[PDB]
Amino acid sequence: TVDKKMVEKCWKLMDKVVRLCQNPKLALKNSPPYILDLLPDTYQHLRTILSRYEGKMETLGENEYFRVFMENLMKKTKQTISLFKEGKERMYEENSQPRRNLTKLSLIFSHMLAELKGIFPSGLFQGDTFRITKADAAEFWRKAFGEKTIVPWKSFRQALHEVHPISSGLEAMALKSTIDLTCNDYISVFEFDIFTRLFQPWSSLLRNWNSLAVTHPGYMAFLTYDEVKARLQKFIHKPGSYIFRLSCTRLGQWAIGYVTADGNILQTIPHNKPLFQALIDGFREGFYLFPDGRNQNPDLTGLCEPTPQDHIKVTQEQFELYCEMGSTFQLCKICAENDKDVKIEPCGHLMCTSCLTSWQESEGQGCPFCRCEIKGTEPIVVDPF
Amino acid sequence: SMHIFVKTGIGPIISLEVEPSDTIENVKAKIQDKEGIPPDQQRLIFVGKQLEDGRTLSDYNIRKASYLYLVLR
Amino acid sequence: DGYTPEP
Ligand SMILES: [Ca+2]
Ligand SMILES: [Zn+2]
Ligand SMILES: [Zn+2]
């Protein structure tokens, strides 16, 4: 239960962590995850929530997700406070174990902040109506948990095991490590969305996860842009050397770092396409050949098998309405040259892949019709009336 | 004089009271009076053709009950 | 931010 004093206590602890990090003796880099920016940003969003719930503090206080988040915020802030207390001088040692823990805790605050903004957009609770990107993933969460925002790990593990069986406790604990971003032993709808975006398609979820995050030597998990260039510097004279990682700023998305014919160390983003599709493409035309400089590259052919696109039938209501316009439902309304063959997830807006690519090339990952973030895409076919 | 329709992905279909002599800028300002969308963020489409701010409705052969699409930034 | 297109 979240009261007035509990929130005030959290902020006082948050302030102490800021004071400890403000020390010029640490000389920490401004690059994300930057805790000196993350904690003050967490204070403002919480303040935004409270102003949206002024008077309605009974509804906010008894809210399960908010209770859990606040409990985890105090715990993570106190953990950082103790980290500075135990081994004070080790905080200034560049690559020491306590310093690596501060970088790990900073990542957690970044995930925690993105989760809070995802569940409470504009300060109002939208967790019960959270839009899961992939359709098959959304149907799993609805049938197993309904409109629940957060569920305990053991409850998530038993539901998942029914659809995608888990081989061992070793696999379950590795699976827990990748999906539980906030490190609180609970799995949120936001965390689920991220895992199901990265390890798509849903139909072979654990196979994709095992082949890309467990058995793949190229998997580096969360890594900053600079660290990718720093790790690939060892393999400058080995053309085809590559690595793939996650970004705290671009949650749910992948990023590949490779060495060219000359070197230079280039970094690309596949954007809403399955990672193995880009890795297989990248291997057959000699770009991604050596994962983490190793001679042996994993064969991912078993994951990529030509599948049919989802079909959408236009109704009588839609046909009649489009006839008045002097057009069809299936025609792309941006170019008016092709039929709609791609669906933006989760808004559902349709256009041709051509208009999408051009929009993404210049404007970014935002829907042309409603400005909603392009969390994912799906190729589709619109069957005329 | 006449009425045109503006199809959006942010709400219901916008019906606007217009004249053929009206510029694309005037139409964008009329959408601004309807949805509060900044005109510099609006991109109007007529049968897959992007409408230029300087030109008028009559220049693109936009007649009565014509449907325009709204694209944002 | 300066990334790189897909090869
Ligand atoms: Ca969690
Ligand atoms: Zn098009
Ligand atoms: Zn949309």
Residue numbers in the entry:
A (entry chain A): 50 to 434
B (entry chain E): 0 to 72
C (entry chain B): 5 to 11
From the paper:
We report the development of three ubiquitin variants (UbVs), each binding selectively to the RING or U-box domain of a distinct E3 ligase: monomeric UBE4B, phosphorylated active CBL, or dimeric XIAP. With ∼600 members, the RING/U-box E3s form the largest family. This family uses a RING or U-box domain to recruit E2 enzymes thioesterified with Ub (E2∼Ub) and facilitates transfer of Ub directly to substrate. RING/U-box domains promote Ub transfer by shifting the equilibrium of E2∼Ub into a closed conformation (Dou et al., 2012b, Plechanovová et al., 2012, Pruneda et al., 2012). We generated selective UbVs for each RING/U-box domain and used biochemical assays and structural studies to identify two types of UbVs: competitive inhibitors of E2∼Ub binding sites on UBE4B or phosphorylated CBL and an activator of XIAP.
We determined the crystal structure of UbV.pCBL in complex with pCBL47–435 and the ZAP70-TKBD-substrate peptide to 2.47 Å. In the complex, pCBL47–435 is in the active conformation in which pTyr371 supports the E2∼Ub binding site and the RING domain is in a catalytically competent conformation oriented toward the bound ZAP70 substrate peptide on the TKBD (Dou et al., 2012a, Dou et al., 2013). UbV.pCBL interacts with the E2∼Ub binding site on the RING domain and inhibits Ub transfer by blocking E2∼Ub binding. The main difference between the two structures of pCBL47–435 is a shift of the RING domain in relation to the TKBD caused by binding of UbV.pCBL. UbV.pCBL resembles Ub, as the two superpose with an RMSD of 0.76 Å, but substitutions in region 3 of the UbV mediate interactions with pTyr371; Tyr66 and Tyr68, replacing Thr66 and His68 in Ub, form a hydrophobic cap around Met374 at the C terminus of the linker helix and Tyr68 interacts with the phosphate moiety of pTyr371. UbV.pCBL also stacks against the second Zn2+-binding site on the RING domain via a hydrophobic patch formed by substitutions in positions 8–12. To validate these interactions, we measured binding of UbV.pCBL to pCBLR variants containing an M374R or an I383R substitution, which are expected to perturb UbV interactions with the linker or the second Zn2+-binding site, respectively. Binding was reduced in both cases, with a KD of 1.6 μM for the M374R substituted variant and no detectable binding for the I383R substituted variant. Correspondingly, UbV.pCBL bound pCBLR tightly in SPR (KD = 120 nM) but did not bind detectably to CBLR. Remarkably, UbV.pCBL recognized a specific active conformation of CBL induced by phosphorylation of Tyr371.
